[PDB]
Amino acid sequence: DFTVASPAEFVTRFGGDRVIEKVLIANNGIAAVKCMRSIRRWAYEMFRNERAIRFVVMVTPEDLKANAEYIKMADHYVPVPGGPNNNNYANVELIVDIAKRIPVQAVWAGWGHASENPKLPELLCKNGVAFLGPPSEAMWALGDKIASTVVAQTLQVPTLPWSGSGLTVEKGCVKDVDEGLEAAERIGFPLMIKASEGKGIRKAESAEDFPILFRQVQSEIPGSPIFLMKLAQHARHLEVQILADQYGNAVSLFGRDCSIQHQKIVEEAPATIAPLAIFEFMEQCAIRLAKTVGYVSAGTVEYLYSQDGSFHFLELNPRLQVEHPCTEMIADVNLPAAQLQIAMGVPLHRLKDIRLLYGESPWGVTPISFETPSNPPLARGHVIAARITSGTVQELNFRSSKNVWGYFSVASQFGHCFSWGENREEAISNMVVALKELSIRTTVEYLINLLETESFQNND
Numbered sequence: 001d002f003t004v005a006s007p008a009e010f011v012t013r014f015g016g017d018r019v020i021e022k023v024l025i026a027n028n029g030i031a032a033v034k035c036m037r038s039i040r041r042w043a044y045e046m047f048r049n050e051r052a053i054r055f056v057v058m059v060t061p062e063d064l065k066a067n068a069e070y071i072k073m074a075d076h077y078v079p080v081p082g083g084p085n086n087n088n089y090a091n092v093e094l095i096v097d098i099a100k101r102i103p104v105q106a107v108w109a110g111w112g113h114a115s116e117n118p119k120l121p122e123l124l125c126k127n128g129v130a131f132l133g134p135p136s137e138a139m140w141a142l143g144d145k146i147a148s149t150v151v152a153q154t155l156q157v158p159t160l161p162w163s164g165s166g167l168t169v170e171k172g173c174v175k176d177v178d179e180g181l182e183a184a185e186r187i188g189f190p191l192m193i194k195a196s197e198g199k200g201i202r203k204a205e206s207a208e209d210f211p212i213l214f215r216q217v218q219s220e221i222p223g224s225p226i227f228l229m230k231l232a233q234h235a236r237h238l239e240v241q242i243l244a245d246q247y248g249n250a251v252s253l254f255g256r257d258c259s260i261q262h263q264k265i266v267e268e269a270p271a272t273i274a275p276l277a278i279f280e281f282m283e284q285c286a287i288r289l290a291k292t293v294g295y296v297s298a299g300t301v302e303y304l305y306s307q308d309g310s311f312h313f314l315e316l317n318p319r320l321q322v323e324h325p326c327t328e329m330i331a332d333v334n335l336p337a338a339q340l341q342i343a344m345g346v347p348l349h350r351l352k353d354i355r356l357l358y359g360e361s362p363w364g365v366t367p368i369s370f371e372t373p374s375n376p377p378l379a380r381g382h383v384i385a386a387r388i389t390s391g392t393v394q395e396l397n398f399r400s401s402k403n404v405w406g407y408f409s410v411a412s413q414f415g416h417c418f419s420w421g422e423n424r425e426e427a428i429s430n431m432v433v434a435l436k437e438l439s440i441r442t443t444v445e446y447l448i449n450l451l452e453t454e455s456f457q458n459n460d
C-alpha cells in the first residue's frame, strides 16, 4: 500500500530525475481514452489522486463536432486544424508548439499519427519536453529496413535471406539487372526489390518478372542503391513486447501472435505456437536489439515464424500498439503507466508491475536480472483479441462474459474485442459467447465461424 503525495515526491523516492505531471496526448479516439484511463488508474493507486497527472488533448473540428468522448474526459483540450492528420495529430511542429506553450512536461503519441516520426522526440527534447516513447536516435536506427536488418544480423538475430546477408558491423545492394538476377537466384522468389532511398519498391514473384520490375525501380529513383529481400511464404507474424528504461535495461513481456490475417484480424497472447525455448531466444534477441539501439519505453520486435520452425527479424515498431491490452492482461502490466514512469526516469526494477511479474516484492529496490532470467515469469492465462468492422468511442460491456471487453470507434466502424481466459480454450470460448451477444452482425458471424474451426482451435 505504498502511496505518496505528489509526482514530485514519486520521482525523488523512486529514483527518477524528471517530474511529469501534465501530459499532451497527440491522438484521439480509443488511443486518447486508453492512455488517460490507464494513467489515472495508476495515479489513483500511487497518489490516491486520479487527477495527479493532468491531461491535455488535441481536438480537430471533426472530433469537436462529433463531441468525441476524450474531449471532456481530458482536463484541458486544444482545438487544432481539420483535414488530413499532417494538419493535426501527425504535425510535429504543431505538437511541439502546443506542448511548449501550455506548457506540458511530456507528450504521448500512442500509435498512428506521428508516433513513428523520429522528428517528434527530436524536436520535443530540443525544447525540454519529454516523450513517452523512444528517443530520436533509436528511431532513426530502426527507421529504415537495411540498417535495421544489418544491426540484427550482427547481433546474431536471424534475418530473412536478402542481398545484404552476411554483412556485419563492429555492398548489400545490386547495380545491374544482371547482378540482381544473380543475387535473386541465391535468395529465391518471391522477393522484394527496394531502392534504399525510397516507396521505390516491387514484389517479384519469379525470375521472369525480375528484369522489368528491377528496371522500374531504377527508373523510379535513379542512382539509388537497390536491395533484394526474400518474402516469407505463409509465415506467422509474432511480436515480442519489450519495455526499456533510460538506463540500458530492457525486459520482454512475452509476445503476441497474429493467428489470422491484411489487417490483423485475430491476435493472441501469449504466442503459444512456437516452442517456449525458441520464443525465449526471440525474446532475448529483442532485448539485445533494443539495448544496442538505445531503445527507451514500449516497443515491439516483429518476427516472421515459418511452419518449419524458423523465425526471422522483421522490424522494431517504435510505439505502443492498439492490441497492447492482450499483453497487459497476461503480464499484469499497466503499459501507459509504465511509459510515464520510464519517461520520469524510473528504472525498470523500480516499476511495481515489473517487480511483481518477477516474483519480487512490489516496492523493493533491488535490481532484477531481465536478460535470460533463471526462472522466467509465467504468462497469466491467455488472451484473444478480435478486430470487428462495419475519435468517437463506444465501449462494449458483455452481460454474457465478465472477462470480455471491447469497443468500436468512428474515424463504418472499426474496433476490437478482448477476451481473457485461464487457458487458450477458455479464452476462445469466452470470445464466442460475447460475439454472439454482439449480434443483437456480418463480421461476428465471420469471426465466430473462424474461431470454431478445428484448425484454429488446434492452432496450426
Ligand SMILES: CO[C@H]1CCCC[C@@H](c2ccccc2)OC(=O)[C@@H](C)[C@@]2(O)O[C@H]([C@@H](C)[C@H](O)[C@H]2OC)[C@@H](C)/C=C/[C@H]1OC
Residues within 6 Å of the ligand: 033, 034, 037, 038, 041, 325, 326, 328, 329, 332, 333, 334, 335, 336, 383, 403, 404, 405, 418, 419, 420
Ligand atoms: C479504455 O479503457 C478500457 C481498456 C480495456 C482494455 C481491455 C482489457 C482486457 C484485456 C484482455 C482481456 C479482457 C479485457 O484490459 C484490461 O482490463 C487491463 C489489461 C488494463 O488495460 O486495464 C486498465 C489498466 C489497469 C491497465 O492499462 C491494464 O491492467 C494492467 C484499466 C484502466 C481499464 C480500462 C478500461 O476501461 C474500463
